[PDB]
Amino acid sequence: NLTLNFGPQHPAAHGVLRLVMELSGEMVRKCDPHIGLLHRGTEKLIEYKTYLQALPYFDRLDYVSMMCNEQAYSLAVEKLLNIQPPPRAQWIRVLFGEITRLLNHIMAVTTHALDIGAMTPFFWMFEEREKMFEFYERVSGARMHAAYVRPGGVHQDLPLGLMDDIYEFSKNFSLRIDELEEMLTNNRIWRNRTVDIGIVTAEDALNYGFSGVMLRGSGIQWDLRKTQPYDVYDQVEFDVPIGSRGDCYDRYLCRVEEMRQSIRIISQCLNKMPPGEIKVDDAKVSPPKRAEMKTSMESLIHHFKLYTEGYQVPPGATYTAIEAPKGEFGVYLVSDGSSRPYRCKIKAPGFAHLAGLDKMSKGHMLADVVAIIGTQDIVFGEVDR
Amino acid sequence: TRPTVRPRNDVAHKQLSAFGEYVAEILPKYVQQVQVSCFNELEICIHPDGVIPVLTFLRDHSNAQFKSLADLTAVDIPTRQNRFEIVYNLLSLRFNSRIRVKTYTDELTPIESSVPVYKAANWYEREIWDMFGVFFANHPDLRRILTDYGFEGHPFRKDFPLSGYVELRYDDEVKRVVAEPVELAQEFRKFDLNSPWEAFPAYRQPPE
Amino acid sequence: TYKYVNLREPSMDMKSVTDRAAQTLLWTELIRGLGMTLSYLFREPATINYPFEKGPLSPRFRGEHALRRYPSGEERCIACKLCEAVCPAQAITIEAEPRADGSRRTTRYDIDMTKCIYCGFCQEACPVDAIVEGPNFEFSTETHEELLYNKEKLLNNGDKWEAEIAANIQADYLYR
Amino acid sequence: IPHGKGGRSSVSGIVATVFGATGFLGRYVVNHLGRMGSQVIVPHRCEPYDTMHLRPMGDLGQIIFMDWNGRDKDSIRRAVEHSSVVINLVGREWETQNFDFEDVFVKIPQAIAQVSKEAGVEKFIHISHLNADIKSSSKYLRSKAVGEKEVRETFPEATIIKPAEIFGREDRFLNYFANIRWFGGVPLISLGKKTVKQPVYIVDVTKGIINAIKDPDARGKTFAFVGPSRYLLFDLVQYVFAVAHRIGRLFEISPFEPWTTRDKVERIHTTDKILPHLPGLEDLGVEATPLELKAIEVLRRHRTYR
Amino acid sequence: KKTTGLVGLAVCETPHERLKILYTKILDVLGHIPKNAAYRKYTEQITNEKLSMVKAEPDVKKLEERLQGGQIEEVILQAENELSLARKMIQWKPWEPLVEEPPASQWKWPI
Amino acid sequence: YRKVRFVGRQKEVNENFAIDLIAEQPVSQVGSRVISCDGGGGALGHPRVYINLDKETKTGTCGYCGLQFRQ
Amino acid sequence: TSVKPIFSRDMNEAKRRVRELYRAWYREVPNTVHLFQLDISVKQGRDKVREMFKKNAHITDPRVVDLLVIKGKMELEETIKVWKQRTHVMRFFHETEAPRPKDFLSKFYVGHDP
Amino acid sequence: ITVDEKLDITTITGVPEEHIKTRKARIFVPARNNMQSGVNNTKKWKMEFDTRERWENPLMGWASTADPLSNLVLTFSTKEDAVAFAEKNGWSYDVEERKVPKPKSKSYGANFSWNKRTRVSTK
């Protein structure tokens, strides 16, 4: 049998993920991919840093999420430190935490529609995506990778503006999602390109430990978005999509309705924000203000020491996970009792979502296999967990 | 006490004190310590003789579904006289409850793996072999994932230093990309950060 | 809650099949839809002519390093080493010394612009507000041997401009 | 003064200067000099792109590039004013359409037998050839021995090195064979009389320099390069077609980089196994390389498997 | 209905007696275990609690209430595996006491 | 020894120096006991610090302030 | 030792296993040397195979040798197939590395006693 | 079960390259950085290996180096498992001893005497 390794080929998509194919003439029936192109030494590296200093290495763990990562870290730290965050701060973590889902669910369709080979829905949506990075630069520090969420809540307040901008932005977005509905849904060939492909629906679709979509849209109703709270996140109203059967085209149609939920939540979140503060007030965790660290005596000693070493975290293990826009996000943060943490093991999606490519692939073509991968939305560097 | 302090609750602290109690009652063969976390988490310390059946007991029931294997990790602890610490984490689907399984071991003593019990441990179980050398029993395919092909280190333990020994370089001496002993441009200046005076009263050690 | 999408049984009668028969046979689909949504070509191309035109920014945008000083030159840096201890890449290296006047200053001052991961914490750690991430992306030399900035780049680079820097701090220091 | 391991990013004390260093010989020598770590100062003639493949041997700050002609003086003086040792390997084959080609082996080794020597250098080493004799053969082979004596007046102690014919990867003499895909493969010249010379292997060449660069006491005591075992046969030409189974030129092509039906064809068929009283290679040890093991590498033709 | 919600199963076929066999299928195997472990004390407790509400009342939809599983065909799977659970309770012996106590200082966290 | 790495590289060097530029300042005077130094402007520059000026009429540039302060 | 072994019991299921895969390496050394298109002599490969087995012969305890068996067998998984693209097999030979001195007078002129 | 009780001193090897026999470890107590007086940084045994050469990197003056270990400190619990870790991987070492001070006898009130010498002034 021919043993071609169609992978390292820089054939668009993402020139990585080099695997083997022991194809039985035309059908595959055996797929054993290799990973480890970026191992980077991540989990060993954090063992020498402090809590505030290690924080951007959670940010660079995806390619896409900037505020959904570091959402799974501060909320994994504030439980250890007996802190609730202040109420103005929680309305921003839901706002940017429900704006990164309008970055994955744009990239999760176009990049899938580029491996397939369509050109024009790649350029028709990233030109609208530019209207959104101006937000990131205006609020935090940079284009994408922002050390913005801290353990002491939000870093700083978003400036004057950004409320007649987001309302200006979000009132003209549903026309753009009505474009791709005409581009892909009512079309037949793309429907014929993906129906009854990847029919994985049994209880081994959950014994493989999958997280969401490539879950509930295939069947079993469950999510971490209204059975487990984060912040002020249950006080808004929305629904969660479910597809019919257990193929890719009934996990594709989650993502059209999923983007039709984030517009509602943003248009529901803006009406409910109170004026208030930014940081936690007790200042053993938050740094004091700049106009304060130049006047009093108490401000500097709880400033100058708070950057030489970090916080004082109590011992005892902990664990949590939140909704990453492609899955769960496990962090088993072992604390020791000093400024420097102990072991920090992460669970990212793709461990389950790509080990189950063995079950999902066989009985099918070779041209099916590239169409499988862009449905799970697998990003490397994120499989470094 | 005030705002900006996490409001704890007692309802989940009650049932998780209730549920895990009669778990040791109905298998006093493998369970050696159960503890309740002060924020609604549970540990069931298990000697690894019962690595398969206790999972197999939590694999199915009518009062405990627990069929969502989320997290297999591995934590080393030197100065314990049995170093390593395999820790699971599993999820009840119908009940919204988290519980972990802490099973210690040592290096050379193997562990009966969870291959028939769960099929999400296909790539997780191999990782501990590549990173520590904990040889699980009866796995159908033990291989090398997430490391390079020529390492002999099992790096995630503590004696392996920060850099390796294998700083790689190219020469045009013939064609090859050859290995070499490691050479840095900078020390990685190691600080000293542990302030004295014991900020924590509750976790005070036995004073001997 | 729920929603059952792509869950709809067909019509299956005499007349509505003629809407599904004219679709496949004469292609009233795929042209009314997909030949009109492409054209849609008459819109204006939103392209920036980069060597002439430039895009928007923010007043808190990061970039090139620089050092400031007081009115008539004083070296605002006091060498209190705090930017070093929070640099995640340890791109800072400072050796200080008592200068003969008596007040302490610096001797070596380094920013590994290769290693520099741009966490910008140096800008938010100096008490006397010395180092500033200056907003100019002018870069791209030709050697690895050049981007290691010594001190006499940085004071010079902090003095190619100041009115660019001094207006952005003065419009943003009230927030932080 | 030296420090630590000389694996990479060391100091090792020495500061050399290698001219030429764009051909087959001068590149491969420096690729050892950036391994032990030193201030290698290599000035090139007229080629910014033709040294691009050279740079990833010295780590960082160890190499440096300058421009020089050679008929000018200070460009050969400004660079060499801060060093310790200096070797030279400059020269080539056939006369240029613009140059003079005689004094290039006479005044150009003299142009760096200038104030260069007076500046305070030591262990200056030039290259020779085993067959460069004062006899009336050839136009290129002789007029190399003229530089062996008329420039030997300057630098009274040098240890000028004398190599035999070399074989490596991309030389001219061994690649003169098997580049002869033609309507007839003739040897030189249909006779097995004098073939062959001593093909020393290229690792032995670069190993002889680095032992001599702090030997010590190797100045004046000139050295010769032993070849393989032992003389060689006519079988070499048959050895080519048996196992082979029968850089700044121009934008399209160079008009004249020929096979040169001139005194090129005789400069190799003049063997001259010279005097064995030179020490010259085994004492500058250790160099011992056969031919039968390194022949698989350089030859490359259409079969590639069998 | 023709789809059972949770995709991957089929309504196959009859409620109210496919269950009623399988509860009683367990209870006969339940008597085989030597009674010193409390495994019998709770498992026979909930099956008699279940089967009393199972046998035998209309409708299918009413049997969903007061029996907290998924749909009724999936409630089979709630006890399908439990039959496979209790028969392996004879094979290994959890009613035996503790074995291999840890060496007296191991589950102390701060090093 | 090091003088070879910049040949044809012109040695881009600083021009002004703050080694001694304090000394060209009109050294301030008050005739009081203790003075604030929020020099460079409020909420920027060096923090507030109080200096005794009784002894060879000076303060000592406060370290932080840098400007020569005296009476 | 209150610990169960991996495969062997005591030294005799062990020492027959290290002999076992030695033949699998021994027919592999001529097999790969024309496959990975590298050019040394094949006897050097057979010397380096027995080089590796003989060095670790100072063990008087089971399940460590058995631990090396799992290490020794996993080497063949990449080896029989093509998973080491012309570099990892060349990584066995410290070829372009400068020689260690290993002599007392030779160490004394270069180095602060490394 | 296959218990097969046997006895051997566990010396593991093959995982590093050569630095078993080359180096010698050191087990000691860190004892009171005496710029201040906090005694929390007692109670934990630590380790540190041999120190080798630190030269100058001739472009900046950085402390570039060989000596690949040079930074490895672990947190031990006591003297008992201090030895047992150095032998389990098996390289040479040397052990210090814990120093605890005098208790000691200090009592105010005897600083005002009738005939003694213990008498303070100028307070």
Ligand SMILES: NC(=O)c1ccc[n+]([C@@H]2O[C@H](COP(=O)([O-])OP(=O)(O)OC[C@H]3O[C@@H](n4cnc5c(N)ncnc54)[C@H](OP(=O)(O)O)[C@@H]3O)[C@@H](O)[C@H]2O)c1
């Ligand atoms: N050992 C042997 O068997 C053997 C055989 C044949 C020849 N040689 C001679 O020994 C040396 C080996 O050279 P090679 O094998 O590496 O080939 P090569 O290409 O001739 O290298 C010698 C360098 O000298 C440069 N050069 C020629 N004329 C020059 C001039 N007027 N000014 C400055 N540079 C000049 C050449 O090109 P650039 O100008 O671009 O730098 C070349 O880079 C040469 O001198 C050669 O004549 C030795």
Ligand code: SF4
């Ligand atoms: S920014 Fe602050 S820490 Fe850095 S050199 Fe200046 S005064 Fe020192």
Ligand code: SF4
């Ligand atoms: S700019 Fe970034 S990398 Fe550089 S010192 Fe500041 S925080 Fe560190």
Ligand SMILES: [Zn+2]
């Ligand atoms: Zn002042």
